[PDB]
């Protein structure tokens, strides 16, 4: 029937719950539990009606579930659907629907908790690049929307403990494609890069590179969690197979960091290994060829649930 608004009306709590062993409290590190207040009124809301909650800068929900129910006392008065932004968009949403239990008489209240990770960058995609300027370390204000009607809360974010002068890698799962997105940023040559090679290959036949979905570029500095803030182009040659992706670059400018990121499929996405190529000759003669191998593991999923109170009137 109608498309109601203002159901989610309060941002009660936004608290971190380290999913795995991350050594900092960042928005890009799971899991952040958003507790939101909701209220449905039978007099003004009818079964079938629909409401969206729009959540900017939220990458995905760190749960295997595809929906969460608004449940006041073992009873379900609405079903909500998770729509992760991932790499498709900069925001995620909750598309909900009123259940047939919400009769004119019934008024349901309560809270819902939502395991969410933010997108503070991670690839050259327009999506991550915009979302890479969404938060900064320290005290931040996070705002969700319900159709013109906003709910906000303050939260403290910590920067990364990894020193941004060395080589930097990260990884992040994309469930809607069964793909893991990984990143590689060469060590910092403060005055620019003369030459260099950089990439990553699979190890022992479990990893494959999605050649179609690569990004290669240079970043003018980085954001607080060691992710690219912008992707320009520069002078490289590109070799890419389903086995592994490598570039040989030249003629870099001071203040810029070269990076390469790509979609992959590994057998067990919560345990895999990659081999990284690493030469760089700085603007300064410091030629050094330092390849390595890095193992990548899993996150600890959480649950979305709700509780509530009902008033039969």
Short mmCIF file of C-alpha atoms in Angstrom, two decimals:
data_model
loop_
_atom_site.label_atom_id
_atom_site.label_comp_id
_atom_site.label_asym_id
_atom_site.label_seq_id
_atom_site.Cartn_x
_atom_site.Cartn_y
_atom_site.Cartn_z
CA UNK A 1 0.00 0.00 0.00
CA UNK A 2 1.88 3.02 1.38
CA UNK A 3 5.62 3.61 1.99
CA UNK A 4 5.98 4.58 5.64
CA UNK A 5 8.93 6.48 7.14
CA UNK A 6 10.47 7.00 10.61
CA UNK A 7 10.24 3.43 11.83
CA UNK A 8 13.94 3.37 12.79
CA UNK A 9 14.05 6.44 15.01
CA UNK A 10 17.18 6.27 17.21
CA UNK A 11 20.83 5.30 17.00
CA UNK A 12 21.19 3.74 20.43
CA UNK A 13 24.75 2.30 20.24
CA UNK A 14 27.62 1.84 17.76
CA UNK A 15 30.35 -0.39 19.31
CA UNK A 16 33.19 -2.43 17.81
CA UNK A 17 33.56 -6.17 18.20
CA UNK A 18 36.90 -7.30 16.77
CA UNK A 19 35.90 -10.14 14.47
CA UNK A 20 39.40 -11.58 14.16
CA UNK A 21 42.69 -10.24 15.54
CA UNK A 22 42.89 -6.72 14.10
CA UNK A 23 45.39 -4.52 15.93
CA UNK A 24 43.26 -1.36 15.58
CA UNK A 25 39.69 -0.08 15.96
CA UNK A 26 38.91 0.99 12.38
CA UNK A 27 35.54 1.30 10.54
CA UNK A 28 36.90 -1.00 7.81
CA UNK A 29 37.61 -3.62 10.48
CA UNK A 30 34.61 -5.77 11.49
CA UNK A 31 32.49 -6.00 13.45
CA UNK A 32 30.54 -2.84 14.29
CA UNK A 33 27.23 -3.44 16.02
CA UNK A 34 24.65 -0.78 15.26
CA UNK A 35 21.74 -0.87 17.72
CA UNK A 36 18.74 1.02 16.30
CA UNK A 37 15.37 1.78 17.88
CA UNK A 38 12.29 0.91 15.84
CA UNK A 39 8.62 1.49 16.25
CA UNK A 40 5.59 0.31 14.29
CA UNK A 41 2.07 1.60 14.83
CA UNK A 42 -0.91 -0.46 13.68
CA UNK A 43 -3.14 2.61 13.45
CA UNK A 44 -0.82 4.26 10.92
CA UNK A 45 1.05 1.21 9.53
CA UNK A 46 -0.69 -1.62 7.66
CA UNK A 47 0.66 -5.06 6.58
CA UNK A 48 2.32 -4.84 3.14
CA UNK A 49 3.60 -1.29 3.63
CA UNK A 50 7.34 -0.77 3.04
CA UNK A 51 10.15 1.22 4.60
CA UNK A 52 13.81 1.59 3.72
CA UNK A 53 16.72 2.45 5.97
CA UNK A 54 19.59 4.00 4.01
CA UNK A 55 23.10 3.56 5.45
CA UNK A 56 25.92 5.52 3.73
CA UNK A 57 29.51 4.19 3.85
CA UNK A 58 28.44 0.73 5.02
CA UNK A 59 30.18 -1.94 2.96
CA UNK A 60 28.29 -5.03 4.04
CA UNK A 61 26.63 -6.82 6.95
CA UNK A 62 29.03 -9.25 8.64
CA UNK A 63 26.48 -12.08 8.87
CA UNK A 64 25.50 -15.05 6.69
CA UNK A 65 21.84 -14.09 7.06
CA UNK A 66 20.01 -12.31 4.22
CA UNK A 67 17.34 -10.71 6.44
CA UNK A 68 16.48 -9.69 9.98
CA UNK A 69 13.03 -9.62 11.53
CA UNK A 70 11.63 -6.85 13.71
CA UNK A 71 10.54 -9.08 16.58
CA UNK A 72 8.63 -7.71 19.55
CA UNK A 73 8.34 -10.76 21.82
CA UNK A 74 8.90 -13.96 19.83
CA UNK A 75 6.55 -12.35 17.37
CA UNK A 76 7.65 -10.91 14.03
CA UNK A 77 5.97 -7.62 13.01
CA UNK A 78 8.25 -6.84 10.01
CA UNK A 79 10.83 -8.56 7.76
CA UNK A 80 13.86 -6.58 6.66
CA UNK A 81 16.20 -7.34 3.75
CA UNK A 82 19.95 -6.70 3.72
CA UNK A 83 21.32 -5.06 0.60
CA UNK A 84 25.03 -4.74 0.79
CA UNK A 85 26.71 -1.99 -1.19
CA UNK A 86 29.95 -3.94 -1.52
CA UNK A 87 31.48 -2.65 -4.79
CA UNK A 88 28.08 -1.97 -6.39
CA UNK A 89 27.39 1.22 -4.40
CA UNK A 90 28.72 3.49 -1.62
CA UNK A 91 25.82 2.70 0.73
CA UNK A 92 23.88 -0.30 2.02
CA UNK A 93 20.15 -0.41 2.80
CA UNK A 94 17.51 -2.28 4.72
CA UNK A 95 14.37 -2.81 2.61
CA UNK A 96 11.63 -3.81 5.03
CA UNK A 97 8.02 -4.99 4.87
CA UNK A 98 5.25 -4.88 7.47
CA UNK A 99 3.98 -8.30 8.59
CA UNK A 100 0.32 -9.32 8.90
CA UNK A 101 0.48 -9.39 12.68
CA UNK A 102 0.52 -5.58 12.99
CA UNK A 103 -3.24 -5.03 13.37
CA UNK A 104 -4.68 -1.54 13.89
CA UNK A 105 -4.73 -2.24 17.65
CA UNK A 106 -1.06 -3.35 17.95
CA UNK A 107 1.83 -0.93 18.55
CA UNK A 108 5.28 -2.57 18.54
CA UNK A 109 8.52 -1.06 19.86
CA UNK A 110 12.04 -2.24 20.35
CA UNK A 111 15.63 -2.35 19.20
CA UNK A 112 17.51 -4.16 16.45
CA UNK A 113 21.22 -4.92 16.32
CA UNK A 114 23.12 -4.96 13.06
CA UNK A 115 26.64 -6.27 12.47
CA UNK A 116 28.21 -3.84 10.00
CA UNK A 117 31.60 -3.07 8.47
CA UNK A 118 32.32 0.27 6.82
CA UNK A 119 34.08 0.93 3.50
CA UNK A 120 36.96 3.20 3.98
CA UNK A 121 38.56 2.39 0.71
CA UNK A 122 40.34 -0.56 -0.78
CA UNK A 123 40.31 -0.50 -4.56
CA UNK A 124 40.34 2.02 -7.38
CA UNK A 125 36.62 1.56 -7.98
CA UNK A 126 34.72 4.86 -7.91
CA UNK A 127 32.84 3.35 -4.97
CA UNK A 128 35.77 2.73 -2.59
CA UNK A 129 37.51 5.88 -3.77
CA UNK A 130 34.60 8.08 -2.71
CA UNK A 131 34.08 6.12 0.50
CA UNK A 132 37.80 6.54 1.28
CA UNK A 133 37.11 10.16 2.26
CA UNK A 134 34.03 9.26 4.31
CA UNK A 135 35.62 8.98 7.82
CA UNK A 136 38.86 9.97 9.55
CA UNK A 137 40.53 8.70 12.69
CA UNK A 138 39.20 10.07 16.01
CA UNK A 139 35.65 11.17 16.85
CA UNK A 140 33.25 10.75 13.91
CA UNK A 141 29.54 11.24 13.37
CA UNK A 142 27.72 8.38 11.67
CA UNK A 143 24.32 9.05 10.16
CA UNK A 144 21.70 6.73 8.70
CA UNK A 145 18.54 7.79 6.84
CA UNK A 146 14.83 6.89 6.82
CA UNK A 147 13.58 8.99 3.94
CA UNK A 148 14.57 12.55 4.82
CA UNK A 149 14.49 11.67 8.57
CA UNK A 150 18.02 11.08 9.87
CA UNK A 151 19.48 9.30 12.90
CA UNK A 152 23.03 10.07 14.01
CA UNK A 153 25.56 8.97 16.60
CA UNK A 154 29.18 9.73 17.51
CA UNK A 155 31.92 7.09 17.55
CA UNK A 156 35.71 6.95 17.99
CA UNK A 157 37.77 5.44 15.15
CA UNK A 158 41.45 4.54 15.39
CA UNK A 159 43.94 4.78 12.54
CA UNK A 160 46.01 1.79 11.35
CA UNK A 161 48.98 0.54 13.38
CA UNK A 162 50.75 -0.52 10.15
CA UNK A 163 53.40 2.06 9.32
CA UNK A 164 52.61 3.54 5.87
CA UNK A 165 56.26 3.70 4.75
CA UNK A 166 56.53 0.05 3.96
CA UNK A 167 54.61 -2.21 1.66
CA UNK A 168 50.91 -2.39 2.52
CA UNK A 169 48.39 -5.15 1.87
CA UNK A 170 44.82 -5.79 2.84
CA UNK A 171 42.01 -8.03 1.74
CA UNK A 172 38.23 -8.03 1.86
CA UNK A 173 35.58 -10.59 1.01
CA UNK A 174 32.87 -9.91 -1.52
CA UNK A 175 30.06 -12.39 -0.91
CA UNK A 176 27.71 -11.47 -3.83
CA UNK A 177 30.39 -12.68 -6.29
CA UNK A 178 32.15 -15.23 -4.05
CA UNK A 179 35.22 -13.04 -4.61
CA UNK A 180 37.89 -11.66 -2.28
CA UNK A 181 39.33 -8.28 -3.21
CA UNK A 182 43.03 -7.85 -2.31
CA UNK A 183 45.33 -4.80 -2.41
CA UNK A 184 49.03 -4.14 -2.83
CA UNK A 185 50.81 -0.81 -2.38
CA UNK A 186 54.56 -0.62 -2.86
CA UNK A 187 56.84 0.84 -0.14
CA UNK A 188 57.06 4.62 0.07
CA UNK A 189 59.61 6.33 -2.16
CA UNK A 190 59.21 9.86 -0.76
CA UNK A 191 60.80 11.56 -3.79
CA UNK A 192 59.23 9.38 -6.46
CA UNK A 193 59.92 6.09 -8.26
CA UNK A 194 62.50 5.55 -11.01
CA UNK A 195 61.54 1.95 -11.86
CA UNK A 196 59.98 -0.99 -10.10
CA UNK A 197 57.89 -4.12 -10.45
CA UNK A 198 54.96 -5.21 -8.26
CA UNK A 199 52.16 -7.75 -8.19
CA UNK A 200 50.89 -10.93 -6.59
CA UNK A 201 50.45 -14.49 -7.78
CA UNK A 202 48.63 -17.46 -6.44
CA UNK A 203 50.24 -20.24 -4.41
CA UNK A 204 49.62 -23.98 -4.92
CA UNK A 205 46.70 -23.72 -7.39
CA UNK A 206 43.98 -22.57 -5.00
CA UNK A 207 43.97 -18.91 -5.97
CA UNK A 208 42.94 -17.52 -9.35
CA UNK A 209 43.08 -13.88 -10.49
CA UNK A 210 40.00 -12.30 -12.16
CA UNK A 211 41.84 -10.52 -14.95
CA UNK A 212 38.76 -8.54 -15.94
CA UNK A 213 38.53 -6.93 -12.51
CA UNK A 214 41.81 -5.23 -11.79
CA UNK A 215 42.81 -1.71 -10.90
CA UNK A 216 46.22 -0.21 -11.41
CA UNK A 217 46.99 3.39 -10.52
CA UNK A 218 48.85 5.86 -8.33
CA UNK A 219 47.56 7.46 -5.13
CA UNK A 220 48.37 10.97 -3.96
CA UNK A 221 48.97 10.01 -0.32
CA UNK A 222 46.70 7.78 1.78
CA UNK A 223 43.77 7.90 4.22
CA UNK A 224 43.98 6.93 7.93
CA UNK A 225 43.67 3.19 7.20
CA UNK A 226 46.37 2.99 4.54
CA UNK A 227 43.98 2.94 1.58
CA UNK A 228 44.17 4.89 -1.73
CA UNK A 229 42.44 8.29 -1.83
CA UNK A 230 42.61 8.68 -5.65
CA UNK A 231 43.59 6.66 -8.72
CA UNK A 232 45.52 8.40 -11.54
CA UNK A 233 47.34 6.71 -14.43
CA UNK A 234 51.08 6.49 -15.01
CA UNK A 235 53.68 4.66 -17.11
CA UNK A 236 53.36 0.88 -16.73
CA UNK A 237 53.23 -2.38 -18.66
CA UNK A 238 50.70 -5.00 -17.63
CA UNK A 239 50.86 -8.78 -17.50
CA UNK A 240 47.84 -10.60 -16.12
CA UNK A 241 46.66 -14.18 -16.12
CA UNK A 242 44.28 -16.20 -14.03
CA UNK A 243 47.53 -17.23 -12.31
CA UNK A 244 48.76 -13.79 -11.12
CA UNK A 245 48.92 -10.09 -12.01
CA UNK A 246 52.10 -8.04 -12.33
CA UNK A 247 53.04 -4.58 -13.55
CA UNK A 248 56.38 -2.99 -14.42
CA UNK A 249 56.14 0.77 -14.03
CA UNK A 250 58.22 3.85 -14.77
CA UNK A 251 58.38 7.63 -14.31
CA UNK A 252 56.54 8.18 -10.99
CA UNK A 253 56.19 11.58 -9.29
CA UNK A 254 57.00 12.53 -5.69
CA UNK A 255 54.04 12.20 -3.32
CA UNK A 256 52.39 9.34 -5.22
CA UNK A 257 52.03 5.66 -4.33
CA UNK A 258 51.57 2.99 -7.01
CA UNK A 259 49.01 0.26 -6.32
CA UNK A 260 47.40 -2.80 -7.89
CA UNK A 261 44.13 -4.46 -6.77
CA UNK A 262 42.09 -7.32 -8.16
CA UNK A 263 39.28 -9.76 -7.56
CA UNK A 264 40.27 -13.37 -6.77
CA UNK A 265 38.69 -16.79 -6.03
CA UNK A 266 40.50 -18.93 -3.43
CA UNK A 267 39.40 -22.42 -2.41
CA UNK A 268 38.88 -21.62 1.24
CA UNK A 269 38.41 -17.84 1.39
CA UNK A 270 39.27 -17.89 5.13
CA UNK A 271 42.73 -19.35 4.51
CA UNK A 272 44.81 -18.87 1.35
CA UNK A 273 48.33 -17.71 0.41
CA UNK A 274 49.71 -15.19 -2.13
CA UNK A 275 53.20 -14.52 -3.41
CA UNK A 276 54.10 -10.84 -3.86
CA UNK A 277 56.71 -9.40 -6.24
CA UNK A 278 58.51 -6.34 -4.91
CA UNK A 279 61.29 -4.38 -6.65
CA UNK A 280 61.68 -0.68 -6.35
CA UNK A 281 64.32 1.69 -7.50
CA UNK A 282 63.61 5.05 -5.78
CA UNK A 283 64.51 8.42 -7.19
CA UNK A 284 67.79 8.04 -5.38
CA UNK A 285 69.33 4.79 -6.56
CA UNK A 286 67.96 2.58 -3.74
CA UNK A 287 67.26 -0.48 -5.87
CA UNK A 288 66.06 -3.36 -3.74
CA UNK A 289 64.27 -6.58 -4.79
CA UNK A 290 62.41 -8.01 -1.74
CA UNK A 291 59.70 -10.55 -2.71
CA UNK A 292 57.54 -12.25 -0.02
CA UNK A 293 54.58 -14.54 0.67
CA UNK A 294 51.59 -13.66 2.88
CA UNK A 295 48.78 -15.84 4.27
CA UNK A 296 45.27 -14.51 4.61
CA UNK A 297 42.67 -15.83 7.03
CA UNK A 298 39.11 -15.42 8.31
CA UNK A 299 36.67 -13.19 10.08
CA UNK A 300 34.23 -14.27 12.75
CA UNK A 301 30.61 -13.79 11.70
CA UNK A 302 28.03 -12.24 14.01
CA UNK A 303 24.25 -12.39 14.30
CA UNK A 304 21.51 -9.84 13.64
CA UNK A 305 18.63 -9.96 16.07
CA UNK A 306 15.96 -7.86 17.61
CA UNK A 307 13.95 -7.60 20.78
CA UNK A 308 10.92 -5.55 21.69
CA UNK A 309 7.75 -4.60 23.52
CA UNK A 310 4.15 -4.71 22.26
CA UNK A 311 1.11 -2.67 23.27
CA UNK A 312 -2.30 -4.01 22.38
CA UNK A 313 -4.66 -1.01 22.47
#
